[PDB]
Amino acid sequence: FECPGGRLTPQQRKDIVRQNNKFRSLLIHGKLKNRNGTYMPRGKNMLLLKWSCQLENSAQRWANQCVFGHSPRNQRQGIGENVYAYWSSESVEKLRNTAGTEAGKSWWSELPKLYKQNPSNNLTDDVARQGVLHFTQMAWGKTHKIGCGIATNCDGGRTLIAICHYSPAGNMLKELIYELGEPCKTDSDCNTKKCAKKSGLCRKEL
Numbered sequence: 001f002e003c004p005g006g007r008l009t010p011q012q013r014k015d016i017v018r019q020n021n022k023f024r025s026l027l028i029h030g031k032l033k034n035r036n037g038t039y040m041p042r043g044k045n046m047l048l049l050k051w052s053c054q055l056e057n058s059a060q061r062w063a064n065q066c067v068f069g070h071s072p073r074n075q076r077q078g079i080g081e082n083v084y085a086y087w088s089s090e091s092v093e094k095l096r097n098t099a100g101t102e103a104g105k106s107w108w109s110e111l112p113k114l115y116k117q118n119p120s121n122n123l124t125d126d127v128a129r130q131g132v133l134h135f136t137q138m139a140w141g142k143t144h145k146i147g148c149g150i151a152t153n154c155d156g157g158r159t160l161i162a163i164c165h166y167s168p169a170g171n172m173l174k175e176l177i178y179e180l181g182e183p184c185k186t187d188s189d190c191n192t193k194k195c196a197k198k199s200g201l202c203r204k205e206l
């Protein structure tokens with residue numbers, strides 16, 4: 001959680017990772033409702049997210065622009081991107097320390113508010129069209145790397161922007177968001193061959 005030249009604190013990085021992994025674990029344990037009021041299906045092989053300084057560096061470069069939008073495609077090759085902003089009429093400095101976790105709650109909130117019952121867990125065109133792509137990237141079983149950048153100087157210090165980058169990039173159409181199964185109990189349950197038993201998520205390093 002130490003990233004040379006970074007503008008985040010170690011704690012911010014940890015809070016972001018711990019929150020997103022908690023979400024993932026709650027999800028694969030069947031504890032989270034979709035828009036229809038029905039629990040999402042239990043999952044297996046959901047990777048445990050690791051912080052990547054490389055990802056933070058690209059996300060931070062974009063956050064520094066103070067633009068509420070995506071970075072250009074050619075700077076996002078192989079990489080997912082989620083964008084969050086908070087617009088105040090006063091200073092946002094007090095919001096910096098929870099920027100990442102507020103952003104994760106906002107992206108993640110797509111599940112209960114916009115994500116209709118999808119039993120196959122397949123990311124079809126009709127599922128994608130709902131605007132659940134921020135949530136689906138945070139939930140993407142194959143993604144295992146996350147890095148985020150934050151700007152609080154935007155609009156005279158009155159706008160907060162948080163940018164998170166994910167690798168590998170999630171949201172490939174016609175692939176499942178995550179595999180249907182049981183959370184890992186032992187290493188051999190995981191295709192990566194290492195299981196985080198407390199969370200039921202599979203470990204994948206870097």
Ligand SMILES: *[C@@H]1O[C@H](CO)[C@@H](O[C@@H]2O[C@H](CO)[C@@H](O[C@@H]3O[C@H](CO)[C@@H](O)[C@H](O)[C@@H]3O)[C@H](O)[C@H]2NC(C)=O)[C@H](O[C@@H]2O[C@@H](C)[C@@H](O)[C@@H](O)[C@@H]2O)[C@H]1NC(C)=O
Nearest residue numbers: 120121122123124125126127172173174175176177178179
């Ligand atoms: C997610 O859901 C989509 C929509 O059903 C799956 O794609 C569909 O796969 C079917 C076969 O599993 C395709 O059927 C074929 O249709 C052609 C058209 O003539 C026939 O010639 C052929 O013999 C089959 O009957 C179906 O067309 C296809 N849907 C579309 C519009 O693409 C998808 O399955 C996955 O993607 C497809 C493209 C293949 O790679 C499948 O093997 C693969 O499982 C579902 N995704 C997942 C991960 O389940």
Ligand SMILES: *[C@@H]1O[C@H](CO)[C@@H](O)[C@H](O[C@@H]2O[C@@H](C)[C@@H](O)[C@@H](O)[C@@H]2O)[C@H]1NC(C)=O
Nearest residue numbers: 034035036037038115116117118119120126
């Ligand atoms: C989730 O809620 C929506 C809106 O209330 C319903 O349309 C879904 O049931 C639907 O059943 C038919 C009409 C068809 O639209 C189907 O695609 C939907 O599933 C409901 N989902 C379920 C599975 O009950």
